[PDB]
């Protein structure tokens, strides 16, 4: 299938309380597989998916050294950005980083990503050409000129076209059915009387992977868009996801309503009913 790898870094300054906290997490598609936390007793990259555990000690050692160095780099970046924006040295600020690769079924790179936000605002991003930058403002243009002079885009491109693609391919080989084969939802409909005249029908999708899903209620096979309560897709805690959709209907008219479920793991789209 088509797949993605992403690293998400968060650095938060705490002036007066020591160096910023740095947290990294890594994902393949919707599966978290590594973490690092600079405030841990002995900070190191740790596994968070079973299939990464087979990587040898040189992997964990190299990655741990990279996060420790990146935490110090982010600390320098936070100091530089509060200078660029003439902000108080007393305040807490956030630097977020998000990078990685999208590959197709053949494992070739479709798209590279390398971008940053400061206090929750886009700051600078590597363009899709992997050769040029988009800067949000005159502060981000200081960063852009520094990175142009340092040939940063070439360092990022080499990673995104090389190690990112090659290591994602490796993870997909080691993760096998857990990453390549979608897990369909377990589905059911529940019925909740509100009064003698109204009841809620709730359509449940549980234990599905990946997170992308569509739940729709239909009345006589027509979508009930404007009348459906849909909760945001939420993690079960076991690497799978949950969602439900609900519609309020007249008591004794439940039989007119069907729930339609679309998920990559289903052999075909499901039609469900209160039964």
């Amino acid at each position: 299938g088509s797949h993605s790898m992403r690293y998400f870094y968060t650095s938060v300054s705490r002036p007066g309380r020591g160096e910023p906290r740095f947290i990294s997490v890594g994902y393949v598609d919707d599966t978290q597989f590594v973490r690092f936390d600079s405030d841990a007793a002995s900070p190191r990259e740790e596994p968070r998916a079973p299939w990464i555990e087979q990587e040898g000690p040189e992997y964990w050692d190299r990655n741990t050294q990279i996060y420790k160095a990146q935490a110090q780099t982010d600390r320098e970046s936070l100091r530089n950005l509060r200078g660029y924006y003439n902000q108080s040295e007393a305040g807490s600020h956030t630097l977020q980083s998000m990078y990685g690769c999208d590959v197709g079924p053949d494992g070739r790179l479709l798209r590279g990503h390398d971008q940053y936000a400061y206090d929750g605002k886009d700051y600078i991003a590597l363009n899709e050409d992997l050769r040029s930058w988009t800067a949000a403002d005159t502060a981000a243009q200081i960063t852009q000129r520094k990175w142009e002079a340092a040939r940063e885009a070439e360092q990022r491109r080499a990673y995104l076209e090389g190690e990112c693609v090659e290591w994602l391919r490796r993870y997909l080989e080691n993760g096998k059915d857990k990453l390549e084969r979608a897990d369909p939802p377990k589905t059911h409909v529940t019925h909740h009387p509100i009064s003698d005249h109204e009841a809620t029908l709730r359509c449940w999708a549980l234990g599905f992977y990946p997170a992308e899903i569509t739940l729709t209620w239909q009345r006589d096979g027509e979508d009930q868009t404007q009348d459906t309560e849909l909760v945001e897709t939420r993690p079960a805690g076991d690497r799978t996801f949950q969602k439900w959709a609900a519609v309020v209907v007249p008591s004794g008219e439940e039989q007119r309503y069907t729930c339609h479920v679309q998920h990559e793991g289903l052999p075909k789209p499901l039609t469900l009913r209160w039964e």
Partner: peptide
Amino acid sequence: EPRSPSHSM
């Protein structure tokens, strides 16, 4: 695997 760090902003 993560990218090696390079320059600060």
